Write a protein that binds this ligand. Structure first.
Ligand code: B12
Ligand SMILES: *OC(=O)C1(*)(*)=[C][C@](*)(Br)=C(O*)C(*)(*)(Br)=[C]1
Ligand code: SF4
Ligand code: SF4
Ligand code: NA
Length: 700
């Protein structure tokens, strides 16, 4: 596998994007000409997904406009910086290409707010589709303009919302709902040129769709592409991607592998029948959803301050606030628990092996980074809901599990617990919920009960499903599983379904041995919540149990950022997607004698250092509905020194297995103060995985 970047983007600012657009021939202006956006070649069947992407696009269309916050005193005046920040924001949300142009009076002449002076124009490339006769092609064929339009609506809704929260009027636009000429602005803003009356964008050879955010927030504008001849797309520097940009051969190489296999070579990872850590199903008790520690915080179990801050902590930054409406309003579309009758739609659904591939291909098409499938075992479901306290049924047979990468480059510039941390969480949550909502819906159209399980609302615990789906191994971080290619840098989305699918198997890439000789995450945790010691048994399975009380308290109540995820940032497996980055992961996996050295050199080379070039976001905290400079400051953490040879023996953490949780009937209306002293003792009394194995062997 040769398609990864040879060159690092460490010195590339985020506003420049993954493409070498700065190397393309440009002119000051070009003459407008009529043009339309790319469309699908083939039309979409009745047995296709089109209705579902159209529904989510309609949902997001609701947030293209909204209320404008009061203007605070903390927004940068410089339009160049403003432009950079907004381009970076759009790339962070996976715009393919971004540009900015001035609006003229023909543009405001229409329904568009006449206060609007500038447009942020972005393109999203068409998804890859399954080749003909591949599983799921008929689900997907002819849905790409609409699938891509949904993504545009989503991005335009978030970005327009972000600028409105900074105190500037702003409106998002896309094909389904636009007040301006999208194609005309794509050309002016320098993303496309016209060929035979249709837009053609350098680099985006699969076709694409547009979004726009028009606004009075003044921005430095871009220049159009030279209107004729060669733009420089194949120049040697662009082709090799010398500045850290996407290699010219990458698209072609990637199209060589089937869509259903994903971009990362997970087929090269060793599969195993039982997972790499002990799982004793007969001893796994089910947990009240009221024992989720965010619910415990919400109910008063962790004290007043945590209770107060529980709703607010991830929504302190305008960007996150821009996502909130989409996140909350997707919840009613999550789907059904009741058995459905097969509708005959969806093609040949008799091979589970092909259904698995179809579902995978579907997820990758929609933008998942990993897709894995396991049985939705009943102990993966919460025991009861936190609102009424009613039992939750194990209503579906299968879990489809997908990982959304939280973003390497952004996190590289971040402290992990600064003003962007929750935006990295919420982006990944929002994108995952959108994708799983669409896929669950499609399953329903085919007559197979399906429900997604998001941040806002899950009735399963994702972790054991990530494990059983072969998407990660247990890591020291604790309540995070670690994937061999994106490390711990993900959020999962799960949807459960009755659709028959062949299931994946657990993976073994040596992580247990690796984490046994690493402590980096533990050392770098602001509240010392991560264990420096050995794995323990906990509710019938082997785990490194973090202190979820301390972590929750820090994430919810710390005031120098918006939440925390520093532990993902500091992990050696959190690496750049270069040849060297991949080689270090391949070595970690394949060469045990090298692991200690890799661990040590991760620190010697100061990996985890904050990269000032990558800090593209504004430090803004919304207090009382108005964005301002941070009241208490901003975490700007650096690599930390060793804790000691004896820390694993001396650190005492608290654990909260079912016995110390609110029991299965309990609702948010009750308070159960966290029993920290009992949790300390519980941990001290936890059985060792060794002892457990001996114990289980004596009943064999
Ligand atoms: C509440 C919560 C937290 C809380 C409290 C956790 C708690 N124990 O209650 C806190 C604040 C600690 C938290 C923090 C973070 N978590 Co969190 N959070 C959850 C959430 C929303 C609910 C978990 C819950 O229901 N209560 C937990 C009850 C059941 O507690 P538990 O008995 O201790 O079980 C835990 C583990 O042992 C594991 N588990 C349960 N059964 C089994 C069985 C087996 C065999 C195994 C191996 C594991 C396992 O799942 C639970 C995770 O809390 C989930 C989403 C979800 N629906 O699963 C994520 C989730 C676990 N968080 C996630 C992440 C990434 C984080 C953070 C890195 C924050 C961030 N920026 O993204 C940190 C990491 C903390 C750490 N040191 O590991 C991801 C993990 C994804 C992954 N790659 O594995 C999840 C799945 C969200 C998502 N959709 O991706 N989180
Ligand atoms: O429920 C939540 O609000 C929430 C927020 C964030 Br930023 C993270 O990481 C989790 Br886990 C849960
Ligand atoms: S464990 Fe919780 S507190 Fe510690 S770093 Fe990871 S997220 Fe931040
Ligand atoms: S940092 Fe070291 S210990 Fe912590 S998870 Fe990553 S590899 Fe395992
Ligand atoms: Na790293």
């Amino acid at each position: 596998q040769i398609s990864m970047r040879l060159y690092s983007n460490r010195d590339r600012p985020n506003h420049l994007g993954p493409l070498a657009l700065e190397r393309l021939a440009r002119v000051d202006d070009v003459v407008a000409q009529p043009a339309r956006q790319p469309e699908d070649g083939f039309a979409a069947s009745e047995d296709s997904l089109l209705g579902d992407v159209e529904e989510y696009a309609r949902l997001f269309t609701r947030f293209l406009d909204g209320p404008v916050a009061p203007l605070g005193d903390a927004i940068p005046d410089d339009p160049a910086r403003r432009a950079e920040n907004l381009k970076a924001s759009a790339y962070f949300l996976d715009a393919s290409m971004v540009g900015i142009c001035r609006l003229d009076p023909d543009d405001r002449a229409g329904d568009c707010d006449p206060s609007h002076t500038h447009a942020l124009v972005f393109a999203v490339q068409f998804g890859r589709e399954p080749e003909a006769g591949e599983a799921g092609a008929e689900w997907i064929r002819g849905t790409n303009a609409a699938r891509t339009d949904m993504r545009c609506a989503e991005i335009a809704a978030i970005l327009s919302g972000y600028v409105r929260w900074m105190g500037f009027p702003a409106r998002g636009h896309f094909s389904g709902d636009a007040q301006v000429d999208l194609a005309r602005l794509a050309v002016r803003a320098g993303l496309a040129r016209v060929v035979d009356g249709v837009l053609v964008a350098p680099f985006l050879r699969r076709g694409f769709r547009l979004g726009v955010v028009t606004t009075g927030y003044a921005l430095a504008a871009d220049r159009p592409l030279a209107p004729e001849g060669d733009l420089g797309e194949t120049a040697p520097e662009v082709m090799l991607g010398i500045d850290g940009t996407r290699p010219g051969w990458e698209d072609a190489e990637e199209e060589k592998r089937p869509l259903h296999m994903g971009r990362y070579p997970m087929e090269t990872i060793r599969r195993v029948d039982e997972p790499t850590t002990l799982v004793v199903r007969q001893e796994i008790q089910r947990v009240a959803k009221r024992g989720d520690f965010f619910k415990r915080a919400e109910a008063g179990d962790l004290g007043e301050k945590a209770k107060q801050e529980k709703k607010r902590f991830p929504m302190k930054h305008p960007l996150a606030l821009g996502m909130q409406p989409l996140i909350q309003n997707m919840v009613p579309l999550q789907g059904t628990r009741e058995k459905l009758a097969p509708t005959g739609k969806g093609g040949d659904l008799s091979d589970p092996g092909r259904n698995a591939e179809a579902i995978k291909a579907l997820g990758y098409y929609l933008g998942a980074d990993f897709v894995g499938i396991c049985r939705a075992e009943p102990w993966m479901y919460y025991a009861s809901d936190e609102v009424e306290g009613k039992p939750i049924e194990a209503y579906h047979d299968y879990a489809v599990v997908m990982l959304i990468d939280q973003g390497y480059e952004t996190m590289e510039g971040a402290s992990g617990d600064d003003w962007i941390s929750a935006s990295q969480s919420m982006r990944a949550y929002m994108r995952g919920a959108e994708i799983a909502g669409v896929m669950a819906a499609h399953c329903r159209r085919m007559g197979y009960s399906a429900r997604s399980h998001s941040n806002a609302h899950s009735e399963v615990i994702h972790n054991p499903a990530i494990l059983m789906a072969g998407l990660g191994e247990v890591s020291r971080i604790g309540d995070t599983l670690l994937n061999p290619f994106i490390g711990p840098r993900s959020k999962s989305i799960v949807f459960t379904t009755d659709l028959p699918m062949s299931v994946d198997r657990p993976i073994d890439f040596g992580l247990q041995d690796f984490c046994n000789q690493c402590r980096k995450c533990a050392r770098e945790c602001p509240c010392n919540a991560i264990s420096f010691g050995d794995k323990v048994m906990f509710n019938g399975y082997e785990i490194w149990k973090a202190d979820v009380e301390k972590c929750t308290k820090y994430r919810v109540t710390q005031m120098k950022g918006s939440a925390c995820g520093r532990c993902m940032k500091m992990c050696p497996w959190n690496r750049e997607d270069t040849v060297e980055g991949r080689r270090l992961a391949e070595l970690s996996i394949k060469v045990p004698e090298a692991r200690a050295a890799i661990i040590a050199m991760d620190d010697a080379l100061q990996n985890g250092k904050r990269n000032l070039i990558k800090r593209w976001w504004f430090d803004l905290e919304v207090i009382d509905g108005v964005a301002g400079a941070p009241r208490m400051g901003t975490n700007e953490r650096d690599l930390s020194p060793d804790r000691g040879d004896k820390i694993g023996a001396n650190q005492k953490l608290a654990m909260y297995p079912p016995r110390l949780q609110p029991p299965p009937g309990t609702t948010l209306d009750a308070v159960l103060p966290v029993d920290r002293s009992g949790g300390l003792a519980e941990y001290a009394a936890a059985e060792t995985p060794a002892a457990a194995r001996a114990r289980l062997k004596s009943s064999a």
